[PDB]
Amino acid sequence: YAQEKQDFVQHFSQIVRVLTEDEMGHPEIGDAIARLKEVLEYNAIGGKYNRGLTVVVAFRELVEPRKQDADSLQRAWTVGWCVELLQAFFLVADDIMDSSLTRRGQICWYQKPGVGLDAINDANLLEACIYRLLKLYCREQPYYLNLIELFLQSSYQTEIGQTLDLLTAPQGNVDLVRFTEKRYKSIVKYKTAFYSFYLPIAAAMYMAGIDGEKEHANAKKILLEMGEFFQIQDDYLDLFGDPSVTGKIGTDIQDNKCSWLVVQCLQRATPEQYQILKENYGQKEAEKVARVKALYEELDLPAVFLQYEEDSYSHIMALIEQYAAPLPPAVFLGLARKIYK
Amino acid sequence: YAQEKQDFVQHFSQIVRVLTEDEMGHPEIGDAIARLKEVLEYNAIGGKYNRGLTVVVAFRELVEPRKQDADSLQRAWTVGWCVELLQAFFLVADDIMDSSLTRRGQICWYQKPGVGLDAINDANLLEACIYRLLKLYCREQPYYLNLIELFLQSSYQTEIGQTLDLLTAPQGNVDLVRFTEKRYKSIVKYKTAFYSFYLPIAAAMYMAGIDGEKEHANAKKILLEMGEFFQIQDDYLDLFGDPSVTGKIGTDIQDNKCSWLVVQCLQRATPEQYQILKENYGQKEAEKVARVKALYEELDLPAVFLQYEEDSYSHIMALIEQYAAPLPPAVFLGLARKIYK
Ligand SMILES: O=C(O)Cn1c(C(=O)O)cc2ccc3ccccc3c21
Ligand SMILES: O=C(O)Cn1c(C(=O)O)cc2ccc3ccccc3c21
């Protein structure tokens, strides 16, 4: 897998070439295109590329190898990068909205000297680049319109999710009462699971000619569920994670996030435990956050997670058995294996 | 005309109804949809509606009246409102980027208590609403894909323009040297003229079945030129405008805008006039701005505008004669009449 991830990053350079070149018939806009190039190179590079890579892996497993000519695979590479650009667009914008300082250990684009709120237009350009690529590489393909609509629906759903999330954790408002499990699962589904798990596989499906509404509804049932586990596990690792094997240290408590952990804690917790979480959930002081962390362990949450994970794992297998056909189960199982590890 | 503008605003209420109702099968997202409703009603209402209205006017003049059934006209109403939503999206975002205080005399959405930078996601939702409407009302139409692509290209071109503009007038940097006429016309074309004049007419064209590349290239030649005059005249009225008949007072000098006025001034101006504009172009003090205003009149700019306008007017007529056919010239002349007045 981590060999294919090399050929994927490899293609970025062509993606950039093809995008930063309508200045050919239009030298007028050269300065703008140069900024676009810089936006792409700062923001589309430096993550794990797993979503876009999933398009390519899925594509191979879905389409005949004798159908996999140089051009087909080229479009697979481009659509996966389209997923990554959709992500880069969300992240640049999300970083501004919640005033983050760093992303991928690195300085947030909007925080760089001389960028600031201009990053809002930068973010929008990242979104537009998706549709320029699709038209450049897929205009003639029969699934063309399908992919445009899929990308657009994924944008809209993520944005609804971001809204839900922003209503839910108004930065400057610690109201633990709106952190229900039902609102949690609703936020994970729209803001994270649709574009992170359904979109990549759906894209490869359409590219492989599988446009059937039932097949997508079935692939969606599996992927949304995998997405829900993914975020739940991420909320768990944020805190109890091993900061060495993860990649950074977590701050969900220090940000009043509607984390899975805190939904669980509140779902339990005597009314004294209620009002001591309602006391430390937000501040930057390591004494106050480690207090809640403690209250979590005291409620055995890490245990109820480890139970949840095993239950979640058997549920997803039951889902693959039931709803994978006639797609090769490998397409879902390859994913499950990498998320649940 | 100002009777049709009534039936257009009238339709907004249905637009909102149809948009704020996927919560039907999805009560989970109710709070998000309510925020969307509030975003639409604050931001899509309160301007002059001329761009969207142009779609409808153009549609009637392009398609047979016996082809104009209740459903056709319904889609015309929706696509025009789609233009308005594309605009509301740009404006909400542009207001944040240059820290404006008011828009349409009213408080900028992002400046309202409790909104702030969340308006970035709000802006994106406005954009997404375009494509939800197009799919809801035009999915089955043969020009469906054409309109998606037209809206997407209009987004991308406006965004390139906004980039060009932001590179050009770095708020915090008064370098009068990058205010060339060529950079000016390049900024007006991408950021303003494509979506303001080409998009509305192009949309009606596609809806009326006129998808021919040459016809659009010809309609584009006229409309881009009309757009250039529109912005140039707007830059002129910003300052020398009569604040009573305009609608508000101008600030282009107080903002270091790459205005037509200042491009002209610099294109003239002895090197003492160079360095006194290079002295007052930006500050808020009414003494320093009225200084430049004076320097403008001293260079007779208002005269060279009045010459420019007449020349521009005959040029556009020559363009309509040449490039309108086989479209009814009324479609372009109705526009010209309202802009040049
Ligand atoms: O990259 C991540 O954010 C998490 N992740 C990891 C990881 O390195 O932890 C592996 C892996 C594999 C496939 C994925 C598909 C969609 C979304 C995330 C994925 C993913
Ligand atoms: O609304 C405006 O910003 C300027 N304007 C006016 C005005 O009331 O000044 C009339 C009018 C008519 C058609 C238009 C088409 C596209 C863009 C702007 C238009 C427009």
CATH number of the domain where residue A327 is located: 1.10.600.10
| Closest ligand (CA of A56) | 1
Ligand 2: atom nearest CA of B335 is 13
How far apart (Å, rounded) are the C-alpha atoms in residues B121 and B125? 6
Q: Ligand 2: which of B4, B222, B339, B340 to mutate, most ligand atoms within 8 Å of CB?
A: B339
Q: With a 6 A CB cut-off, is A337 part of the ligand 1 pocket?
A: no
Judged by CB atoms closer than 8 Å, whether chains meet at A145 and B145 is answered as yes
Residue A94 marked ligand-binding = yes
Chain breaks in chain A (C to N over 2.5 A) after: none
AA letter at A275: Q
Q: Ligand 1: which of A51, A335, A341 to mutate, most ligand atoms within 8 Å of CB?
A: A51
Which residue is it, tokens 């949840």?
Answer: A308
Question: Residue A69 contacts by C-beta under 8 Å, 6 or more apart in sequence?
Answer: none
**What are the tokens at B210?**
């006129």
User: What residues in B contact A126, CB-CB < 8 Å?
Assistant: none
Q: Domain range for residue B154?
A: 1-341
Q: Which of B8, B95, B189, B191 is catalytic?
A: B191
**What are the tokens at A8?**
């994927």
Q: What are phi and psi of B135, to 5 degrees?
A: -75, -40
| Closest ligand (CA of A192) | 1
The candidate with the shortest Cα–Cα distance to B125, out of B80, B148, B92, is B92
The candidate with the shortest Cα–Cα distance to A31, out of B311, B187, B326, is B187
Resolution of this entry, Å: 2.2
- The CB-based long-range contact list for B290-295 (8 Å cut-off, 24+ gap) reads B292/B253, B292/B262, B292/B265, B293/B239, B293/B253, B295/B265, B295/B269
Total domain count for chain A? 1
Q: With a 6 A CB cut-off, is B233 part of the ligand 2 pocket?
A: no
Neighbours of B175 (CB within 10 A): 11
User: What residues in A contact B33, CB-CB < 8 Å?
Assistant: 160
DSSP-assigned states of every residue in A174-233: --GGG--HHHHHHHHIIIIIIIIIIHHHHHHHHHTT---HHHHHHHHHHHHHHHHHHHHH
Examine the residue annotation and report whether B255 is marked as an active-site residue of this protein: no
Closest residue, chain B, to A32 (C-alpha): B164
Q: How far from chain centre, in Å, is Cα A167?
A: 20
Ligand 1: atom nearest CA of A197 is 16
Neighbours of B148 (CB within 10 A): 20
The candidate with the shortest Cα–Cα distance to B234, out of B317, B339, B314, is B339
Q: Which of B17, B22, B67, B98 is catalytic?
A: B98
